């Protein structure tokens, strides 16, 4: 565990993280895909061997000794708001199980279902609150990666609010 488990947010490419493992915002088929997934495929391509896993689950594949946790959030274009919300919560619970099983002291994590799977809606709060529900009982240092300057401010505020 970390000596004083924390949440932090950084605005940069998750493929340049400084943590002991990474969560990929994966597709169910283990394909190279877009956004975070595209960077993850370029950085850790060996981790995509048998990475296919259903919506609402996480599957870990090693790149050397570095763990890549493939977490499949729902595509809100296809799911109802209700079913989508259930699957997005579930994906994060499976990430918390994997992080605990691996015994890492830190994890880099993107906000699942906020990009091309968002169904054209702002899901910062919905996705972040499911991340907190899952990860609050873990003792890993969590570092959230984002791209947008206004998202960095809102994520930083949400973390600071509960401190």
Ligand X SMILES: Nc1noc2ccccc12
Q: What residues between 93 and 132 interact with ligand X by CB under 6 A?
A: 110-111, 114-115, 118
Binding flag, residue 143, ligand X (CB under 6 A): no
13 is in an annotated binding site: yes
Shortest Cβ distance from residue 127 to ligand X (Å)?
A: 8
Shortest Cβ distance from residue 47 to ligand X (Å)?
A: 15
Binding flag, residue 31, Cl ion (CB under 5 A): no
The site partner of 157 among Cl ion, ligand X, none (C-beta below 5 to 8 Å per kind) is none
Pairs from 58-62 (Cβ < 8 Å, separation ≥ 24): 58/23, 58/91, 58/94, 58/95, 58/97, 58/98, 60/98, 60/101, 60/102
120 is in an annotated binding site: no
Binding flag, residue 117, Cl ion (CB under 5 A): yes
Cα separation, 104 vs 120, in Å, equals 34
The site partner of 158 among Cl ion, ligand X, none (C-beta below 5 to 8 Å per kind) is none
Cα separation, 53 vs 58, in Å, equals 7
Place of tokens 């919560």: 89
Among residues 121, 137, 132, which one has the least CA distance to residue 84?
Answer: 121
> Which residue among 1, 2, 13, 29 contacts Cl ion (CB under 5 A)?
13
Binding flag, residue 46, ligand X (CB under 6 A): no
Give me 74's structure tokens: 């729902």
């Amino acid at each position: 565990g970390a000596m004083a488990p924390s949440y932090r947010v950084k605005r940069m490419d998750i493929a340049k993280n400084d943590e002991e493992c990474v969560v990929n915002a994966a597709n169910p088929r283990g394909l190279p895909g877009d956004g975070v997934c595209k960077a993850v495929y370029k950085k850790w391509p060996e981790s995509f061997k048998n990475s296919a896993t259903p919506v609402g689950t996480a599957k870990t594949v090693m790149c050397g000794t570095y763990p890549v946790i493939h977490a499949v959030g729902p595509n809100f274009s296809n799911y109802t708001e209700s079913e989508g919300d259930r699957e997005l919560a579930a994906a994060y619970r499976e990430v918390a199980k994997e992080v605990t099983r691996l015994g890492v002291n830190s994890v880099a994590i993107p906000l699942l279902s906020t990009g091309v799977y968002s169904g054209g809606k702002d899901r910062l709060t919905q996705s972040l609150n499911h991340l907190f529900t899952a990860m609050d009982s873990t003792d890993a240092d969590v570092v959230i990666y984002c791209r947008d300057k206004e998202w960095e401010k809102k994520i930083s505020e949400a973390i600071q609010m509960r401190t």
